[PDB]
Design a protein around this ligand. Structure first.
Ligand SMILES: Nc1ncnc2c1ncn2[C@@H]1O[C@H](COP(=O)(O)OP(=O)(O)OP(O)(O)=S)[C@@H](O)[C@H]1O
Ligand SMILES: Nc1ncnc2c1ncn2[C@@H]1O[C@H](COP(=O)(O)OP(=O)(O)OP(O)(O)=S)[C@@H](O)[C@H]1O
Ligand SMILES: Nc1ncnc2c1ncn2[C@@H]1O[C@H](COP(=O)(O)OP(=O)(O)OP(O)(O)=S)[C@@H](O)[C@H]1O
Ligand SMILES: [Mg+2]
Ligand SMILES: [Mg+2]
Ligand SMILES: [Mg+2]
Ligand SMILES: [Zn+2]
Ligand SMILES: [Zn+2]
Ligand SMILES: [Zn+2]
Ligand SMILES: [Zn+2]
Lengths: 35, 334, 343, 368, 367, 360
């Protein structure tokens, strides 16, 4: 898709996405997840 | 074995070290197939075992020379894989080391020749490491391998590495032309195909490998337009499958270079096939197919007893799958 | 020169014994019962000696010659049984057999047991010589289709009552193990003297003890019945059979199917079958396999097989059976996204 | 020492044999009617009574009273068999007696008459291990044994045994004792020994035995040891937790339900167990593959495993194909990258977190 | 002068650290007299399988009688302590793997013990026995002589046949906790009158995963390196693991997208003379710890407590996706490190990969 | 009799060894304090001093003047160990002695007292080659051996050994020698050998040593043989196939700017001149790393490349960092697969064409 994603794919970087939030529980206060 | 002209300088150099008494006990010759490294090792052993050498060449009439001609010298314990096998076991290395463990019968020097250290087993190489580290007095080793990287790091560390570079391209071309009566284009194609190592190209010409290559090229020419790559299996399934895979890889590489723009190609003898292959396939498809072919060739070479036809047909099916539009093409990555 | 079957061999023995007998086949129970019936009829006739020998190069023949050329001190009209080797007679064994036929005597009752001979092995000097007075009882194991009728006849001969469900259960549990099937029938008869064996009766006193061969597994995959393929894979795994032979047998048929499918685009099927010289009984089976799956399949199957071989002889793991059953399910009319199997 | 439950509670009579009702009835009928086959083959699994039933048959066949299905248990022969020192009871193992010389010696000794027994019973164990020569010798001697000898074979994997042995032998393949029978037998044993226990502890022991009475006896002996002369629910639960080695299935369940704290606790337990981390990843991958195949076809779950049958079935029916596919892909990637992870433990934790709360960005086949 | 592992081997049930469940079970069995005839011990290396087996052998054969608290002074106890007890037959499975050797071993089982009350057998790595050897051993395991006890031991219990498992009481020893290892190291060092620092003990305990024998070996090596003292600097140098603070600062610079700090930190590390792969592994471990903290709150042990608060900040500010991105970038760089022209060059290029593909603040993209 | 530099300059004291300060200090302190273990495993890459350190420790233990941190090297036992004659120092090859009888006699003769010395040292080489049964049998000896035998274990990679072996052995990680240490050792050896040497030649040899000093000595001997008894920069460059010119930079520029014909011509002429392809890939990787560094920090560029400064700077201004990383990744992938390619030329050409495929 984008140049960033294509380059990361070519470098072998998986770029894991969150998909299923909520499982991340505890002392987590991420106000801005850049999404 | 044969003594090729291009062995003249390097030999004259190596023997010079032994002329001064500073020769390295362990010598590893990095030479491609057909470079005649076996002849060089034989000449070095003959010089070492000569009782009364003159200049560089051996006298040829002393006891050592007579035994070398008869091939029954008590010294000169050679190591080679069994005729019915393709690897050298640890038992052979053990017995050769035991024989070398004592003085020479003739009182001169003891020579050990490993025909191909690549075929040497890991256990065999590890056993040879000790005797290679501190050989007894007047003990000389002459290893040989196409790719020293394939050998163990320790074993390569012990040896002094000598690289037998091939001759100039024009010199090899004219030598083959004088040897074999064939079109210069075919000679150049064979030389480039054989990594520019004459003798190997000569061996390829001597056998039926050239006809096999022509049949494979015709099959690929028929397949590329129609897309029926499966028929290629008919021209690919053979005991020499790795060589045919190398030929196909070189053809794909030539097509890709022609796409990118180039003045020279390894398969110069078939401009039409290269042009058609480059035109009918995109560079990404060519790269993917070439990588797959090289990977399968490596698997066939390294793996022992693998079902040849199964791997070849799997490769053909995957190649056909790649040609289908919208299919993600794999990219190499460590 | 009479070819017969063990079911009707009792009448043949009753009407009169024959000079030469030979039991050829692979079914163990049928061979055993035919041998027992022949031996009992011989004993009733008045034969007390039951000498048995196994044919093998290590074994000698002087004792056999002496016993065939000599009577018994306290008996007469001996009987001799020869256990042929599994592979089959060789040149030395052929010479021994023709020598035996040369000095064969009427008072000696010859019985031969072993695997069924092939067409090349069928023709021989001793076989032709014995053909004048040879009765050969075919002893092959009945196919899966022939199994239900055979077990029904066996139960009826035992005065039992079997329904369709019980017959199916017995066939499933003892497929290719008819000896265990008969033993189970005897056990059920003893357990329930009434003779009525309903589905609970049989199912509560049976065990899965079937025996198969890799060809049976390949046939099951071709047919496409997942349950049978999984069952045969389980049986082979429990038998300790190595997966290499299964992989090779599967590979042969897979390559044949791929070639047929790819070359059937513009070529009649009949010409391809004739050229390949495949079994006539397998023509319809190959057609069914070809039309059951399209070129979208037979591609991930080959890649899966290659991956299985690599993980077998490179990683040397123990998950080969999981890959085999995954491929089995793939060859059937199943989705098999192949993401799990890494096809 | 107070003996051990497995040794003490060997069934010394047919009446006190748990389960195996069909085999018991067949043997009783054979002994009563006087019809005895040349050879008997007791098969099944471990700790179900193959050896016990074979010894019961031996003592009932050589009892001073005669060939009876209800041995007295008090005569010289019965007592000697129970003590395991009867001369004619020739117990041999195919393990260390597969040699040609030993098989020949056994065959030669077979011909001799019994010393003081009506029958010279040979209780061979693990017959599936006999070599081809030994197997052929056994078949030949079983073809027509002398009337005074008997063979009581006790194997555990009849599939290895070719049907030729069955051609002259009668098989009585045992079956798993099931949870209820094992629980009842454990309750009876504990009550007879004046041992306090709770019903839930007995249920847990029976379920953990996995269809093997010997396993149940060993487990309850362990419970007594840890329970200090009294079986209790907490003691048996703790013992099971220490001995449990199904961490892969529990981890798969936790990943399915996205229970992060459960995954962390299970990983900590596995670390305490100290199992190989790559082995754990391979086991989880195999479990996921089995779940996928079960979803594809119910028959894919072989009967070889039964302790986790319900868990596997519920997991297969609950999760959709896509989720199990994602779990399998993530676990495969984690296993591949484990060697280069900072630590094996850290690699396992990272791949578990990725599987349970992440998803990889798939590649795009850009148009040509 | 004697090795710590050999000198500090347990001589009584109290001396054993951890493994409370098996110790309690064995003590109760010995006290109540309900002794089984076959005990299998399982676990990882160095957990104390052999120590517990020898303690049980001492308890069984003690002169005062069968007890869970052997005196340790009678002749049998001393002989077992020195490893010169005739009845305690210490056998190695690999030494006798063929069926013939194990049959020869079992031939002498019937004979009465020389002086001890039981003829205890202690087989090491029993899983190495062949299947035939196991089957031959089954009969004696089921009904051994009243004066014979078997004490099997193996690191891998899954290889044993199910029959063997069912014939014996299983005890799976658990890997010792890091705190338990640290406490044992502190106790032995205090008994030996050796100076030590808490950080050094924490580092040694972390190095020894769950095997106390590895902890003792590393402690002895640190004693050698430090010339009779266990100092934090000496242990850190020997382990080749730089302080967590430097790696934490490195990752903080990496996330902040300021490459000058990254360059300065790597230059300082090079001056310190630390292998680069260790630095990369430490960075990956820090990233993994941050990810775990994001997953669950109690994911950091007390050993890292000194830097816990700071770590927690990185959990709150840094999203999870970019944490995974950095982890993957560092992991792939470590994958490429062996083939790089230089270790320093490889790590520098990995860090430049991380900075160039930084999500929040990508490195400038000049055309 | 003439001996190679590796055999001639084998360390004979704890001071002659270069690098590995920590392990040497630990061994010396243990010998001085008397706290000596019975199992010393040495783990590290080839040519770092496994055998040398093991023999030095054996000499220190077996010295006739008591257990000394630095053996004198002149005693009868010391000289015999130096010459490989000491009977109590049994040097065993793991690969050769894998059979059952070998290990069985190895663990059966431990009870016999040492013939000459006070310790019967067992120096087992490449211990990772022993069979699993061998390790299982030797666990007991490695745990509680008699107080007259010491096991010295050497292995290239320690992880392959069973975890129990690692548990029962003191592990010493011999750090790979850095370029500076190798250069200093080579300079000292050549000065003591009365052989002229240039700093550039020593730097190149140390760089090509790849962290192993035995390989450095072997390369020095090869240069001596080829360099008519002279370690000259030109001779070493010819032997090692080092470009040390602008060809690598020009080829990198062509690769970044596509223009496949230029890359093919450069590769063809490089093959004609007969250079080392691994050296070319290493040079390209270094150039790409330098470009990335200057993109991050312009001050991180030296003056050696001054003649090619501006052009290099142009790349730092023209190539985005992501493209630099892509090219570096492709070159590393080519480096990994270069040995396994059908030909070195084919591998290099495939790598360069794959890199060419990448573009903004
Ligand atoms: N059916 C049963 N009824 C009562 N107790 C049983 C039964 N099966 C096993 N046990 C108990 O378990 C002990 C050992 O059982 P075994 O009969 O030896 O098991 P097994 O079938 O012989 O296992 P194998 O053949 O060695 S694999 C007996 O002494 C009993 O205490
Ligand atoms: N549980 C423990 N309690 C006390 N000291 C222990 C314990 N585990 C290990 N140690 C110490 O570490 C040494 C080694 O213990 P061992 O029991 O011999 O190791 P091991 O577990 O028998 O070796 P394995 O499992 O066969 S590889 C002992 O002598 C103690 O000094
Ligand atoms: N650390 C070192 N200090 C001094 N000389 C060294 C060192 N490492 C290697 N050498 C030299 O290289 C020669 C052989 O190397 P070794 O000392 O055997 O190292 P090595 O690790 O044992 O090699 P391997 O692992 O057996 S291939 C020695 O005789 C020295 O001349
Ligand atoms: Mg039993
Ligand atoms: Mg132990
Ligand atoms: Mg060495
Ligand atoms: Zn001469
Ligand atoms: Zn009785
Ligand atoms: Zn005591
Ligand atoms: Zn000295």
């Amino acid at each position: 898709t984008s140049r960033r994603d294509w380059q990361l794919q070519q470098l072998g970087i998986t770029q894991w996405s969150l998909r299923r939030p909520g499982a991340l529980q505890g002392e987590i206060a991420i106000a801005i997840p850049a999404h | 074995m044969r003594w090729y002209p291009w062995l003249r300088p390097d030999f004259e150099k190596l023997v010079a070290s032994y002329q001064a008494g500073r020769g390295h006990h362990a010598l590893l010759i990095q030479a491609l197939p057909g470079m005649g490294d076996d002849a060089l090792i034989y000449a070095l052993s003959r010089y070492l075992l000569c009782q009364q050498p003159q200049g560089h060449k051996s006298c040829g009439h002393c006891r050592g020379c007579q035994l070398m001609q008869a091939g029954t010298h008590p010294d000169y314990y050679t190591l080679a894989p069994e005729k019915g096998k393709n690897t050298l076991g640890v038992d052979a290395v053990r017995e050769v080391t035991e024989k070398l463990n004592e003085h020479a019968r003739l009182g001169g020097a003891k020579v050990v020749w490993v025909t191909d250290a690549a075929l040497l087993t890991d256990a065999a190489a590890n056993a040879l490491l000790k005797t290679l580290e501190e050989p007894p007095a007047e003990t000389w080793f002459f290893l040989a391998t196409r790719e020293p990287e394939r050998l163990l790091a320790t074993l390569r560390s012990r040896c002094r590495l000598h690289y037998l570079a091939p001759p100039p391209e024009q010199y090899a071309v004219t030598w083959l032309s004088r040897e074999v009566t064939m079109s210069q284009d075919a000679l150049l194609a064979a030389l480039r195909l054989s990594a520019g190592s004459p003798g190997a190209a000569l061996a390829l010409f001597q056998g039926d490998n050239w006809q096999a290559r022509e049949t494979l090229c015709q099959a690929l020419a028929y397949s590329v337009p129609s897309g029926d790559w499966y028929s290629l299996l008919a021209a690919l399934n053979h005991e020499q499958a790795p060589a045919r895979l190398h030929w196909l890889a070189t053809l794909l590489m030539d097509a890709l270079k022609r796409h990118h723009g180039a003045a020279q190609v390894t398969n110069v003898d078939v401009p039409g096939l290269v042009a058609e292959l480059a035109n009918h396939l995109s560079p990404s498809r060519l790269q993917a197919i070439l990588g797959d072919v090289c990977h399968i060739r490596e698997q066939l070479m390294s793996v022992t007893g693998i079902n040849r036809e199964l791997l070849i047909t799997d490769l053909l099916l995957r190649i056909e799958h790649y040609l289908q539009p919208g299919v993600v093409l794999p990219v190499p990555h460590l | 020169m009479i070819r017969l079957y063990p079911e009707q061999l009792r009448a043949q023995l009753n009407e009169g014994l024959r000079a030469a007998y030979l039991l050829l086949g692979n079914d163990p129970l049928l061979l055993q019962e035919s041998q027992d019936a022949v031996r009992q009829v011989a004993a009733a006739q008045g034969f007390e000696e039951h000498h048995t020998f196994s044919i093998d190069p290590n074994t000698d023949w002087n004792a056999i010659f002496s016993l065939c050329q000599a009577m018994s001190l306290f008996a007469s009209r001996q009987t001799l049984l020869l256990l042929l080797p599994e592979n089959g007679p060789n040149a030395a064994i052929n010479e021994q057999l023709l020598t035996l036929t040369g000095l064969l005597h009427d008072d000696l009752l010859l019985i031969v047991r072993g695997n069924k001979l092939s067409k090349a092995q069928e023709n021989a000097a001793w076989f032709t010589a014995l053909a004048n007075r040879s009765v050969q009882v075919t002893c092959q194991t009945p196919e899966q289709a022939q199994l239900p009728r055979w077990v029904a006849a066996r139960a009826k001969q035992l005065n039992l009552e079997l329904d369709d469900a019980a017959n199916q259960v017995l066939c499933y549990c003892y497929e290719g193990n008819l000896l265990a099937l008969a033993q189970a029938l005897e056990r059920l008869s003893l357990l329930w003297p009434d003779g009525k064996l309903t589905l609970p009766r049989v199912e509560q006193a049976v065990n899965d003890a079937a025996h198969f061969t890799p060809f049976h597994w390949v046939d099951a995959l071709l047919m496409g019945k997942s349950k049978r393929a999984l069952h045969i894979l389980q049986q082979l795994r429990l038998e300790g059979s190595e997966p290499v032979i299964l992989l090779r047998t599967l590979q042969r048929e897979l390559l044949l199917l791929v070639n047929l499918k790819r070359q059937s685009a513009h070529t009649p099927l009949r010409a391809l079958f004739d050229k390949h010289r495949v079994w006539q009984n397998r023509r319809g089976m190959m057609g069914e396999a070809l039309n059951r799956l399209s070129q979208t399949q037979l591609r991930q199957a080959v890649q899966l097989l290659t991956r299985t071989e690599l993980t077998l002889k490179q990683d040397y793991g123990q998950s080969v059976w999981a890959e085999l059953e995954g491929l089995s399910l793939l060859l059937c009319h199943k989705p098999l996204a192949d993401v799990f199997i890494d096809g | 020492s107070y003996q051990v439950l497995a040794r003490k509670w060997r069934p010394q009579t047919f009446a006190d044999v748990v389960g195996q009702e069909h085999v018991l009835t067949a043997l009783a009928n054979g002994l009563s009617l006087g019809r005895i086959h040349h050879a008997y083959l007791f098969s099944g699994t471990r700790g179900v009574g193959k050896t016990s039933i074979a010894r019961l048959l031996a003592k009932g066949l050589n009892c001073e009273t005669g060939i009876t299905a209800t041995p007295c248990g008090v005569c010289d022969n019965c007592r000697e068999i129970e003590q395991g020192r009867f001369v004619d009871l020739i117990e041999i193992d195919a393990a260390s007696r597969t040699k040609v010389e030993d098989t020949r010696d056994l065959l030669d000794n077979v011909q001799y008459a019994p010393a003081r027994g009506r029958f010279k019973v040979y209780l061979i164990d693990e017959v599936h291990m006999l070599s081809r020569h030994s197997f052929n010798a056994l078949l030949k001697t079983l073809e027509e044994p002398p009337e005074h000898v008997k063979f009581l074979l006790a194997t555990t994997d009849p599939q290895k045994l070719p049907v030729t042995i069955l051609s002259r032998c009668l098989q009585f393949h045992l079956k798993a004792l099931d949870v209820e029978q094992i629980r009842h037998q454990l309750e009876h044993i504990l009550n007879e020994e004046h041992i306090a226990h709770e019903p839930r502890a007995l249920q847990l022991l029976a379920r953990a035995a996995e269809g093997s009475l010997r396993d149940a006896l060993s487990l309850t002996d362990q419970a007594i040891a840890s329970g200090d002369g009294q079986v209790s629910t907490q003691a048996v639960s703790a013992m099971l937790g220490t001995l449990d080695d199904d961490q892969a299935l529990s981890l798969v369940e936790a990943m399915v339900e996205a229970n992060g704290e459960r995954v962390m606790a299970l990983i900590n337990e596995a670390a305490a167990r100290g199992i190989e981390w790559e082995a754990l990843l391979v086991e989880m991958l195999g479990l996921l593959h089995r779940i996928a195949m079960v979803q594809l076809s119910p028959a894919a779950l072989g009967n070889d495993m039964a302790a986790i049958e319900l868990r596997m079935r519920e997991l297969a029916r609950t999760i959709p194909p896509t989720d199990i596919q994602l779990y399998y892909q993530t676990l495969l990637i984690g296993r591949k990258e484990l060697p280069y992870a900072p630590d094996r433990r850290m690699g396992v934790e990272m791949t578990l977190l990725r599987a349970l709360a992440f998803h990889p960005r798939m590649p795009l086949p850009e148009p040509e």
